[PDB]
Design a protein around this ligand. Structure first.
Ligand SMILES: [Mn+2]
Ligand SMILES: [Mn+2]
Ligand SMILES: [Mn+2]
Ligand SMILES: [Mn+2]
Ligand SMILES: [Mn+2]
Ligand SMILES: [Mn+2]
Ligand SMILES: [Mn+2]
Ligand SMILES: [Mn+2]
Ligand SMILES: [Mn+2]
Ligand SMILES: [Mn+2]
Lengths: 377, 377, 377, 377, 377
């Protein structure tokens, strides 16, 4: 059918040419709750609304501060690799966090003491590469598709430092001197970057492990998130990875949230920093409460980026018939939330009643234990 | 069917949950031309992706620098009024330009010499209100739906100055002193803004005309764009309104462009300033050429805002079976373009051939007359 | 007596040590109108709250963006000269506008074509010196005290270019070459700036007039404001000087406003730019209406600087038993205001009634002629 | 010999490894005048200290805000073309002003009404191309070397819009549709920019002139500066070109100054805007007087860029045995200066004496006529 | 001879007046490698190109963000003191790091617990003074010349806080009250700063040591860098001082690099922060690789400051017949580099071959041990 921006006696039918498919995807934007009010920045952007860079071996598309200007500290790439295909040896200023949505991949990293780490990463696994440390990704037999987050919103995917691009713009006489070889011995070097290229599948992980004089890295750069025990509550599950458990992950804290149909990520805020969101599957709505009587509701579905500025109140409600699965990402060394429910449960009941003009029948339902995801009754 | 980001031997199928409706709307973003290259800012945003403010009497939703950060100088509201309904007497810092897409409306404006102008505006008509001059809109029997452009990208629709909001936050004793009345005589003033409110239809325009001691305004604040003779070329029509013909319109230059199926707005640029676009109907693609080998293609359809920064090369191609109708908007006192075709036609043919590695068979087709919209052969 | 921040059942007595003299000067800040609301920037600063630079011959103290951060475009100096005393030949980047509050003075200016202008300025007279044109002030037999406004808020009075400071930091060999003299002939030049210095009274103006080969300046740099016919209304008078009458005054528009006891500068705004205010005498209050339900009331008395950002609604009410006299200053080539009264008077009466929920008894009092200053009944 | 930073009893010999050639070029920086004082920004940069872009057909090197951060509004390219060689058809956001130091060249320009202008430019001639209007340069039989100034300091020479780069990043199907040709007919288009390329010498100017339906351009884009009558004074000559004589040159005012050995550009300032300088030949020093007792002396020779911020006092002294020849460039619609000598000459003599602690023997030498360049006695 | 900007068939002879001495110093800027490409900021500035402040007792000249705008975080002073001469007791906001190139000096520092440290510093020794802690320098019998680095690029040497300048601008009655003395007892205080002044040589260090009630400082503020064991490789030596060995040096990490003739600091980058460079002796070239196919080569010799932004690839090659000696400086708590050679050595050989289109003959030369400086074969 044909949705209209009408709420009781407010609003009207659209009379100009319009985008009905988009209107259908955004029911709480075309018809917001009556409780929404005031100017709030856009907190919503789709990867589908971005240019996709296509290469032999896969693709890469990004949502940055140029697409979503509220998110100045965090940016993201949706990258896809075909079986065997390689994301070229490269480095950047930004730390990089990743979540493997589909497939698997081999990563390499060498640290500033010349110690190497090589590991395979499967669905639900993470990696984190600290700023400036060089790395690669090679998809295994299924290919790979993953979400990357970089800890600067001004990140430009096209502007990373690539091995072959470095060498293509270094004098041949210097490269030859650097390695103790002749110019003729390096005449076959590529003339330009590769970036993403097709390649034969690698062999077993154990055969790739490189031994060196410098030791093992002190902490792994991968983490098996879904192998961890989640916080379990009535309507879903939360898996947290920050620097307290995934030790190397100093600038990125993360949680994978699953919300069953009829459930919601409860009313809460984060007392530490802004939240950046990626919707893996399902359909949600979220109201962002911006203080001073400002609040705005957004719709999200698979492929969307979301954002909640520092300390703004919010919830994420599943509004579909399938599980809602999304990531909460923070540029910090730890995850933290304040639960509205638990906060009030931990205060004298008469004081809460004095605030809410409600009685014992309300303060009796409050829980001193935090349940991040709650189920509707 | 199911589009995939695949171009020959480049790209791959999407393996994660995805937004197929959006992918279908953006064929040249999911599968860009091979000639696209480099980081280019987002130049595309849908009104469907914004919060819609619903009121008794209609609605208002906006695309600003908070949604589309490239557009720092220009912002826009899609406003809808039901029959008789009034957009409250108000003013703002920004100059306001409008295009009436549907219906009709009565506007009022009083200038800084106390001269008034009251006029009815129909489909295809414009208004322009200079910065800071107070005005109103009242829809007539059909209702009204129109596009507003303000000459600051930081514009916030919720933050305009409203008559009743001014009075609600002025001391009653001061209002009473201002008008020579008692506080009791103004006790019924509204306690808060109205903004948009339902009202009975007005009478005939001739009965509303207010006479004053200060004279007629020197220039009208409305303009009948579609009553003008357009530039006509093979594939469509261009109607231009800037300060040279619509005299009051000092900070906004505009053109309505119609492009037939199988036609395109030719390769050109604007030598004066950035272009802001609104797609009224149809489906388009545009490549923005950003220099230094940077170019990015965008898709647009009805309800979309587009942008072309100052001097970037572009075209707008109709990719549907219906007419493509869009507005080109500039914060300047005049419209100007440089046609790629006419530029080259006006140079010595051997000099052009020396540039393009093409011969007489090419330079023979160039035209010294500008045809803004051309038809495919 | 002892004022308390109490308004009906709101507020409380001050319980900590406090500044009672300041509280007494700010009755509408200690006890604001109930109609005030929200965060509004400070719009008020006293010259008494600034460091006064004392020199042999007088003094200078300033209110800049460093004191009043809302005023980024306009800054001000209160300067005093004793009889005969000279404000050293100097120039600056900023244009300078002045109002002579007390005494009289001789000014000199030489333009970029080598044409000179020398004139005497009395109480109520203005000068304007365009950016970068060199000038001096010498007080006559009464001394002089005047208010200066510069068209940059970052102005620093201590940082102007002085004749003798230029020469003190130029090599003697270069100064000698510049003028065709020996180094010995200029050995007595000052080692440092003078800035303000005592000097004998000058002779008659007619004896100082310098004739040159380059002609008379096309427009005078002084203006006799109080010799003009003011706009007269019931409660006071407005004298306007902008570039339309005081021709050289291209970047500063000004009005001197006198408001009788029991009168007010009516509810209005300026559709062109921000207003900067100086209170010469009397006591006032003003509410600044900042849109979106924001309004804040300020008190002012002699020696205060005030400010009203671009298009904000305001009035200035006399709250004392003596005349209120203040300047309204604008960085623009013209003065303009929109009168709330005249605006509504120029609209259909039923339309105004529909806005205000008031009837004919109200719209009957509106006046189509603007009266900037109105008297209480 | 070996210069040392020693001035009387101040300073000391350099004890670390040092750049003696640079020290020799900067005698007034290694040993500044005793009258210099305080922090002043760098106002000096050499083209010799920049990367030179070498192409088949010539070279281009630039001094921008990235080299000289004080110059935020103006940037410059030193470009060289071999005989016949072409600087590719291109456009940019910035207006472009040029001075032909060596050789000659043919320029083309087409304006936004499709009117063309084609002209030959010789040593001492100028061109000005308004922002966004497309143009080319082709050197004639002697080759050409010229100085370009762009009216934005952030200009990046590598980032201009080139004809062939536009076409290389536009879909072939779109280019074909634009011109009414087949894709096969344009298959030979270049794959990348040319920028500068070798080409056969053009024929006579008269044979290149293109006639069109749109008329002659209203104003020429070239100007014969050295054919004008200069201001002549004792020590040299000044040729001025601004928008009052070179009509199209709206954003750039310029003067070519020649200073004989033993002469100087007198003590003056500019009351309108900053000055950007290029030293064509000879050797100079200049003291920049920055107010508040700040002054710093700089050395300049051929290939140097200089700068004087808005209203700062200065002189330019020839310190070599050959003529000193330099350009003074301003982002404005007019040239203006205030002469220290003429300023003081136009004031009462006793008033000047009171300032300078000097007598009639000094004020007697002052001249009411401006002599921009003066000769030492 | 006379260098020309010609590389094979690219470039041309210079036809305008030029700076041949500078061209000779910059062979890789006049004729860059063909592998250089794109706009890169200036990364090069000479102390010889700065104003030298001369005082009785020595001199000081600086390279700041005003000279080298890329270096926003780090600034530098080249200071020289004659035997016995004192750099006045002073403090500043910035932390200060120093390297003693010539001579020796006595430093004093008192920390915020009133603990003092007094020590003599010789050639190759360092000091570090934390932000805001007061200090002095007095040259011993040889005089002293040293390089200072401050951890803010906006540093202004003329704007430090000096003991005597503090007292000269404090009321005498307050100074007298502060110390319990009469105004007459302090009447001989200087009227202005000293900054640098001549003084008799101090006695033995042991006689100056001041004992106090507050203890010894926990960490020394000097460090004997050249007494440390350097990293030794074939073509030179690297001495590192950061907060891990020179404990107080929390905001500055440093390395002294010596590169023999025919050697180079290998291809590497820094994964932590920008590098600031000072060339003590010799002649170098360095290519800065800026990503996205951007690279620019610079020449450096004694007296030059260099810069490499965060993570950009680089090498430093000795291009003279004497040792090359330079400092690498970082605003961080540690030194770190990633060696291109070691990185690739630590990866599977077939993976490296797949990247470089090179075989076993290349990957066989890679070394798992880092050699910062390598010798040509
Ligand atoms: Mn990466
Ligand atoms: Mn959250
Ligand atoms: Mn409006
Ligand atoms: Mn266009
Ligand atoms: Mn002045
Ligand atoms: Mn006002
Ligand atoms: Mn150009
Ligand atoms: Mn000048
Ligand atoms: Mn220090
Ligand atoms: Mn390094």
């Amino acid at each position: 059918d044909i949705p209209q921006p009408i709420r009781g006696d407010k609003g009207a039918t659209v009379k100009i040419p319009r985008n009905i498919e988009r209107d259908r995807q955004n029911p709480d934007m075309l018809v917001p709750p009556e409780t929404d009010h005031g100017t709030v920045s856009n907190m919503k952007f789709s990867f589908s609304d971005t240019h996709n860079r296509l290469e032999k071996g896969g693709y890469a598309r990004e949502v940055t501060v140029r697409e979503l200007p509220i998110s100045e500290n965090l940016a993201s790439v949706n990258m896809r690799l075909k079986p065997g295909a390689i994301r070229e040896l490269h480095w950047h200023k930004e730390a990089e966090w990743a979540y493997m949505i589909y497939g698997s991949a081999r990563v390499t990293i060498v640290d500033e003491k010349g110690r190497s780490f090589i590991d395979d990463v499967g669905e639900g696994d993470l990696w984190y590469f600290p700023s400036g440390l060089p790395h690669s990704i090679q998809a295994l037999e299924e290919g790979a598709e993953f979400l990357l987050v970089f800890d600067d919103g001004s990140f430009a995917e096209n502007s990373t430092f690539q091995l072959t691009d470095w060498l293509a713009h270094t004098p041949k006489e210097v490269i030859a001197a650097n390695f103790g070889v002749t110019k003729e011995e390096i005449s076959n070097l590529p003339g330009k970057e590769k970036y993403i290229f097709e390649n034969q599948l690698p062999g077993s992980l154990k055969d790739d492990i490189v031994e060196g004089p410098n030791g093992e890295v002190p902490y792994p750069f991968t983490y098996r998130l879904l192998e961890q025990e989640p916080i379990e509550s009535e309507g879903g599950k939360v898996y947290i990875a920050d620097s307290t458990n995934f030790k190397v992950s100093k600038t990125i804290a993360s949680a994978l949230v699953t919300v069953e149909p009829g459930a919601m990520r409860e009313l809460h805020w984060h007392p530490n920093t802004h939240e950046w969101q990626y919707y893996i599957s399902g359909k949600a709505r979220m109201t962002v409460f911006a203080s001073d009587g400002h609040a705005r509701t957004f719709n999200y579905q698979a492929g969307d980026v979301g954002y909640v500025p520092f300390a703004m109140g919010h919830y994420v409600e599943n509004i579909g018939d399938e599980p809602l699965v999304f990531l909460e990402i923070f540029k910090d060394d730890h995850y933290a939330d304040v639960s509205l429910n638990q906060w009030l449960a931990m205060l004298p009941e008469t004081f809460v009643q004095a605030h809410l003009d409600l009685g014992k029948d309300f303060t009796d339902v409050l829980s001193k234990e935090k349940h991040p995801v709650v189920k509707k009754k």
